[PDB]
Amino acid sequence: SIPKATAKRLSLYYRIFKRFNTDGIEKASSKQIADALGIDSATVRRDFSYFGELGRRGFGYDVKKLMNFFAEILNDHSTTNVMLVGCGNIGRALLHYRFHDRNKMQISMAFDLDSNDLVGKTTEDGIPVYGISTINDHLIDSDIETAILTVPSTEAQEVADILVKAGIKGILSFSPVHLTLPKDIIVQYVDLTSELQTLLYFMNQQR
Amino acid sequence: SIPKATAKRLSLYYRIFKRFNTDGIEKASSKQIADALGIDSATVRRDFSYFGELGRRGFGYDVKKLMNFFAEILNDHSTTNVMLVGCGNIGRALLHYRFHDRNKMQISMAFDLDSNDLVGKTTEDGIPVYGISTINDHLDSDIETAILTVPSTEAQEVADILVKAGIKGILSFSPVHLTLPKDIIVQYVDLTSELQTLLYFMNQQR
Ligand SMILES: NC(=O)c1ccc[n+]([C@@H]2O[C@H](COP(=O)([O-])OP(=O)(O)OC[C@H]3O[C@@H](n4cnc5c(N)ncnc54)[C@H](O)[C@@H]3O)[C@@H](O)[C@H]2O)c1
Ligand SMILES: NC(=O)c1ccc[n+]([C@@H]2O[C@H](COP(=O)([O-])OP(=O)(O)OC[C@H]3O[C@@H](n4cnc5c(N)ncnc54)[C@H](O)[C@@H]3O)[C@@H](O)[C@H]2O)c1
Ligand SMILES: [Cl-]
Ligand SMILES: [Mg+2]
Ligand SMILES: [Mg+2]
Ligand SMILES: [Mg+2]
Ligand SMILES: [Mg+2]
Ligand SMILES: [Mg+2]
Ligand SMILES: [Mg+2]
Ligand SMILES: [Mg+2]
């Protein structure tokens, strides 16, 4: 029963509640949460109504309890292994990123063109790089159902389609291209132009 | 007044409307927009009630007129020049990104440690790299926005340096909460939280 726009804030509330927990805060008000997130307290309260919590009275939401609620809903106690497709400027950078404090989110497999110089190599942390033509062979017995897509924009749709045929069910795409994929496939876009336009909008509201 | 959570979608609506316009769609429904964005029609309808005559009906939204609305509210007809601070794995990647079709959003200079090999040089697309100690010298400038891609351990210190030099907004990639003055805006790119969102949605499809 959580609305989709509220669900897109789960992971942000999780981050903030872990911080508040680490800071020894027992009860967090809607205004403190809003301020941390850069939204309005009214949106916070409505959102939290879907998490079982009223926010109109009392001293705040129970930090430990909610933190644990977010952890459970985001499946933060189990591991998700993802593949990275396109090991160029941004893809190579992402191989260096620590996605999770407890390694519950990891890149476990990467792909590039069969002829790319990285193909055949393995990272310091044991992520092999394969050719894209081998993807179906590698995904046969695999636990990976999630891909990060960092190919050139001109190639994103074609590679996305390859991924879905291979069994990928969700894609975190960095290309600024709308992907047309089947309805049961989730695509999450990282759009840094849209992030900067947001930022600038808020900067202009402060002036 | 547009609520802050609605304002965080302006840029997303702008992308969608530019696509619909390019595709020759004259009128869009709340459901078509919601499906594009991956949210609920009801959220779209409420948001658009804050966009004036153009969104009051809750249906048949005029694509060209709303695209123009979003371009105006986002100041998409003028140029924003930004600086990048930290030319490492992700910083160097970003210097290769084309942020805007019409170059209205651009990285115009970058910074690293004074001792970094890239300092004194120019990137592929001819962006100059300077040492962080010289930031206040470089900032007579039109730049009031930074992208922050230093190590996580250095993010707060470098953020403080930016704010002292005159930066008013920071797009941060470090998974570190920054404590800065109220009048400084920080937008956090948090790839962990993006992937958690994606997996939540994937689990809802099963
Ligand atoms: N550069 C950035 O930091 C940044 C930021 C945001 C978005 N983006 C977007 O991310 C995408 C990639 O950008 P980039 O600058 O890293 O591109 P890039 O050109 O450096 O790298 C793309 C990689 O994908 C590989 N590739 C090409 N076809 C492939 C295929 N069929 N299968 C597997 N791999 C294939 C290439 O060999 C290359 O290694 C682009 O759409 C870009 O717009 C980049
Ligand atoms: N690797 C990724 O793709 C990725 C993705 C998401 C988030 N992040 C985050 O982005 C940040 C940077 O990651 P990275 O792997 O690119 O780090 P990195 O160590 O490769 O790069 C950091 C750069 O910052 C420079 N630097 C250090 N102190 C500085 C200072 N005082 N002033 C100016 N420059 C300074 C360094 O010389 C170096 O070039 C980290 O917080 C990381 O968690 C990285
Ligand atoms: Cl949203
Ligand atoms: Mg909302
Ligand atoms: Mg997780
Ligand atoms: Mg090849
Ligand atoms: Mg979505
Ligand atoms: Mg590009
Ligand atoms: Mg653009
Ligand atoms: Mg189910």
Author numbering:
A (entry chain B): 6 to 212
B (entry chain A): 6 to 144, 146 to 212
Paper excerpt:
In many Gram-positive bacteria, the redox-sensing transcriptional repressor Rex controls central carbon and energy metabolism by sensing the intra cellular balance between the reduced and oxidized forms of nicotinamide adenine dinucleotide; the NADH/NAD+ ratio. Here, we report high-resolution crystal structures and characterization of a Rex ortholog (Gbs1167) in the opportunistic pathogen, Streptococcus agalactiae, also known as group B streptococcus (GBS). The dimerization of Rex is stabilized by the swapping of the C-terminal α-helices and the dimer binds to a consensus Rex OPerator (ROP) sequence (TTGTGAAN4TTCACAA) to repress expression of target genes.
The Rex-NAD+ complex crystalized in two different space groups, P21 and P212121. These changes are confined primarily to rearrangements of the N-terminal DNA binding domain. The rotation leads to an increased distance between the recognition helices (α3) from NAD1 (18 Å), NAD2 (15 Å to 34 Å). Comparisons of the three GBS Rex structures reveal significant inter-domain movement between the nucleotide binding domain and the DNA binding domain. The allosteric effect of DNA on NAD+ binding observed in this study of GBS Rex supports this idea.
